[PDB]
Design a protein around this ligand. Structure first.
Ligand SMILES: CC(C)=CCC/C(C)=C\CC/C(C)=C/CC/C(C)=C\CC/C(C)=C\CC/C(C)=C\CC/C(C)=C/CC/C(C)=C\CC/C(C)=C\CC/C(C)=C/COP(=O)(O)O[C@@H]1O[C@H](CO)[C@@H](O)[C@@H]1O
Lengths: 78, 162, 539, 33, 74
């Protein structure tokens, strides 16, 4: 986690699964208030973060945490 | 509806103004027929052999159903229009390749009887043939015995070809 | 007695040895009358080979197989629920929107369900379903010697137990409305947002998806020929494999295995289900490899093989394998071979039992060749397109391209009956109308050339007559001739519009790309083309 | 935990062998003469 | 003026080669261009042209040459 590596990887997986180019992905933009994901498409990226990172995400914090600070702040809290 | 209400007498008028051999006509004195609809005439009890093209337009007449190897003997042969019957339906069912017509033309005489589609005279809806048997007879007694159990054997090859 | 004119052994016993000459029993007819004499009998055991029912052992094994694969899928669902994901909030927030397209698709599949055109062999399947209660074995009633349509045909038993209620044309045809509202409710809620944010954020993409579903559904699947159920089978197994790809589970993948197995059984043209199963082979295998660590291989793939072969528990419910082999050779000998259907799809436009050739080839040149090839070319050409998510789109492309070389003109010789991919070709067309949208195709040349292709293929679609099958064309605008308006044909004027668009594209090739009249004219050409076809069929 | 893993394998492939053995099973044919 | 051996084997060699050239995206052995040209011809004379249009079907074995080079490329 060097605050750029992880971000780039998470954008490579957003591009692979959601199909969004690594431009819109900033902290200012998010799942439901700025960008466009869905409740069941976000479990795909959730399980991919559980795949390449050993981070067992709770089922309540997944729906709870709304922005893209969710994915960063949890891989950097082992 | 073409002739008005005061019209009383008709007379057929013909001509053969074409002198080739294949141009001829024939007539018959005119008749006002006693018309009954098919559902009134053919009930839901007399089993008909519906052709496969016309099964959805005729959803109430009971078709001839086969019970453990023998069928009912049909009494009518409700069929599609003439080109689809001659080139597309009776070539799909005859005694050459399985078929249902192989057990109707071998036993029954089919004679076409006159039908008209109501209020749209000029369209071939199909044809309604009335079967009648060549000799008067009865459905067989057909004593059946069960419990010829099986593993995966066939009793013998079916008749498919001469 | 003996023979007079050699003795030929020691008896008069004579006859041929070939067991292909046997009588065609119709009765036992005579012309002698009176009381019966002793020693007179004629006996023949009629070939009631197919008319069976299973014993207690086979019925017990069938029930144990069904309940055992239900237990092993429930144990699988308890096994793969070890990543702590619970299925809360049924009918999700992605679903609870009602768009204006549902007033065109739900209220357009009900007007066509009442007044529309039935298929060619709707009478054939209704007639072989109305008599199978008394016969007891799902007989292929008409053609093949009373042999059953049971090498697969479980679906007609649903119609057989559905003729217990009145069997009019509006009530037995109901599995092609319920399977027309769980196609569309899976086409606009579960496979278009799965296909990316552009196909769901746009409204023209979901509009062309609905209009192509309508225009590919309305000629073929409305009858009683079960091709609408193959459409709903392929769509259910596609969304049930994609849900399993996203959430990482395996019980939707096993349910997709059993659904592609089941809707292989409805018709022999149901190989689009196993093509959709095969296209997700690598993601299913990588799901198995991901869960291969926490749980061993043997409790993981055993419910897959359990829920893969339970189609045999509904197919072989009352037919022995020897009986099914004797039922399938019969069609193979006297039946129409693959060289018989080829010269029977052009000649006189004769009604054929399981085919549409006028409309099929005319339905499947447009709606999976003006929206299959451009979306294919723009898919594999541009390696990183902005909105469309790769992988759920390539799997659907693989379903369409697999079924074109898996079923059609390989293993069975049916001609093009376009009603198979009426559901998944809707989502395919949505991909196409987001792949020629102005946000992905900057060139006005490359859009105007595609509009010329659209007008040309719409001209070719209007080229032949306006002819429905048997009693659907009791009254039509153009029953016998080509549809013509104002003296000249509509085919020629759409050819002329194609020429105008092709010349406007060739003229814009050299100037090169303004956005004044071209952006208002080629914005979403698929829904306006499919909507013109839908409104001309409905009108 | 290990109970559901055991139930996925046994009576899973028992379901496979029963579902493949259904065609080769006894049936009570009704013969007619 | 105004099908089991001839196509299915060619499909069973055609389907792997397209996926191999798609996934690897340049092969050490075969040259890049006229491979894709032989793909373009075979993949265009299989369908839109002779299957979508339906111009006089069932002249079965007319991939005597290009199917041979396809099996060679397989
Ligand atoms: C690793 C692992 C284990 C799994 C991971 C891999 C993954 C994820 C996926 C891979 C798949 C998978 C999983 C499998 C696991 C599970 C597994 C091991 C296999 C599962 C594979 C799948 C997806 C389904 C399995 C299907 C099975 C097992 C049975 C299907 C039912 C059938 C058809 C059985 C066939 C019966 C037999 C023995 C012979 C039948 C003959 C046949 C099928 C065709 C010939 C008969 C013909 C030609 C009929 C045509 O006759 P006609 O002339 O066309 O007649 C017309 O009919 C109409 C009448 O109206 C008219 O048009 C005409 O008259």
């Amino acid at each position: 986690a060097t605050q750029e590596e992880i971000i780039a990887g998470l954008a490579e997986i957003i591009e692979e699964v959601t199909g969004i180019e690594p431009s819109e992905v900033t902290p200012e933009k998010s799942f439901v208030d700025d960008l466009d994901i869905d409740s069941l498409s976000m479990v795909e990226i959730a399980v991919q973060t559980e795949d390449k990172y050993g981070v067992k995400i709770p089922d309540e914090d997944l729906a709870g945490l709304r922005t893209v600070g969710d994915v960063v702040a949890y891989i950097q809290k082992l | 509806s073409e002739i008005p209400d005061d019209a009383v007498a008709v007379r057929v008028v013909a001509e053969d103004l074409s002198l080739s051999q294949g141009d001829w006509i024939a007539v018959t004195p005119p008749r006002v027929p006693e018309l009954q609809s098919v559902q009134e005439y053919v009930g839901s009890d007399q089993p008909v052999l519906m052709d496969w093209a016309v099964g959805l337009a005729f959803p109430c007449q009971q078709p001839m159903l086969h019970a453990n190897g023998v069928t009912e003997v049909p009494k009518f042969r409700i069929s599609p229009d003439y080109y689809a019957k001659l080139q597309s339906t009776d070539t799909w069912q005859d005694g050459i390749n399985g078929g249902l017509l192989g057990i109707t033309d071998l036993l029954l005489r089919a004679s076409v009887m006159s039908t008209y589609l109501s209020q749209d005279w000029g369209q071939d809806w199909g044809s309604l043939r009335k079967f009648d048997t060549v000799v008067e007879a009865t459905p067989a007694e057909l004593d059946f015995g069960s419990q010829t159990h099986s593993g995966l054997y066939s009793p013998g090859p079916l008749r498919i070809r001469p | 007695l003996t023979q007079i004119s050699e003795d030929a052994g020691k008896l008069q016993r004579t006859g041929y040895p070939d067991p292909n000459l046997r009588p065609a029993i119709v009765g036992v007819f005579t012309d002698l009358t009176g009381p019966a004499p002793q020693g007179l009998s004629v006996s023949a055991e009629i070939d009631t080979r197919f008319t069976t029912h299973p014993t207690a052992l086979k019925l017990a094994a069938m029930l144990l197989a069904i309940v055992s694969t239900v237990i092993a899928l429930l144990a699988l669902w308890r096994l793969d629920r070890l990543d702590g994901r619970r299925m809360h909030r049924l009918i999700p927030t992605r679903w609870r929107t009602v768009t204006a397209v549902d007033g065109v698709v739900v209220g357009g599949m009900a007007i066509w369900y009442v007044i529309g055109a039935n298929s060619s062999d709707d009478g054939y399947i209704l007639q072989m379903a109305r008599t199978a209660e008394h016969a007891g074995y799902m007989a292929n009633y008409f053609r093949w010697f009373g042999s059953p349509e049971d090498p697969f045909g479980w679906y007609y038993n649903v119609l057989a137990l559905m003729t217990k209620v009145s069997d009019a044309s509006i009530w037995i045809r109901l599995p092609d409305l319920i399977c027309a509202l769980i196609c569309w409710l899976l086409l606009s809620r579960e496979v278009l947002p799965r296909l990316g944010p552009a196909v769901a954020g746009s409204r023209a993409a979901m509009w062309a998806a609905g209009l192509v579903l309508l225009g590919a559904w309305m000629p073929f699947n409305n009858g009683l020929r079960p091709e609408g159920q193959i459409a709903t089978g392929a769509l259910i197994t596609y969304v049930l494999i994609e849900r399993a790809v996203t959430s990482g589970r395996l019980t939707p993948a096993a349910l997709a295995i059993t659904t592609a197995a089941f809707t292989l059984g409805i018709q022999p043209t149901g190989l689009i289900a196993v093509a959709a199963l095969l296209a997700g082979g690598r993601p299913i295998l990588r799901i198995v490899m991901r869960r291969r660590r926490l749980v061993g291989t043997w409790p993981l793939i055993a419910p897959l093989l359990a829920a893969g072969t339970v189609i045999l528990a509904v197919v072989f419910a009352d037919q022995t394998i020897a009986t099914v082999l004797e039922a399938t050779r019969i069609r193979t000998a006297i039946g129409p071979s693959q060289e018989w259907w080829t010269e029977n799809l052009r000649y006189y436009y004769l009604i054929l039992p399981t085919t549409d050739g006028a409309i099929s080839r005319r339905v499947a040149f447009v709606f999976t060749a003006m929206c299959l090839f451009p979306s294919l070319f723009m898919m594999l050409r541009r390696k990183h397109i902005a909105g469309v998510a790769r992988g759920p789109a390539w799997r659907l492309m693989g379903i369409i391209f697999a079924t074109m070389f898996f079923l059609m003109f390989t293993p069975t010789k049916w001609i093009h009956h376009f009603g198979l991919f009426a559901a998944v070709g809707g989502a395919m067309a949505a991909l196409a109308t987001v792949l020629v949208s102005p946000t992905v195709l900057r060139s006005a040349r490359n859009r105007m050339a595609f509009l010329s292709l659209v007008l040309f293929v719409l001209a070719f679609c209007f080229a032949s007559t306006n002819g429905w099958w048997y009693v659907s064309n009791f009254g039509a605008p153009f029953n016998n001739s080509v549809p013509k308006v104002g003296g000249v044909q509509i085919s020629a004027i759409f050819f002329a519009l194609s020429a105008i668009a092709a010349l406007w594209a060739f003229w814009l090739h050299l100037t090169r790309t303004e956005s004044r009249v071209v952006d208002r004219l080629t914005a979403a050409p698929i829904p306006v083309a499919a909507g013109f076809m839908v409104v001309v069929m409905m009108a | 935990v290990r109970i559901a893993r055991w139930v996925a394998t046994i009576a899973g492939l028992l379901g496979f062998v029963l579902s493949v053995s259904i065609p080769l099973l006894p049936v009570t044919q009704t013969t007619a003469t």
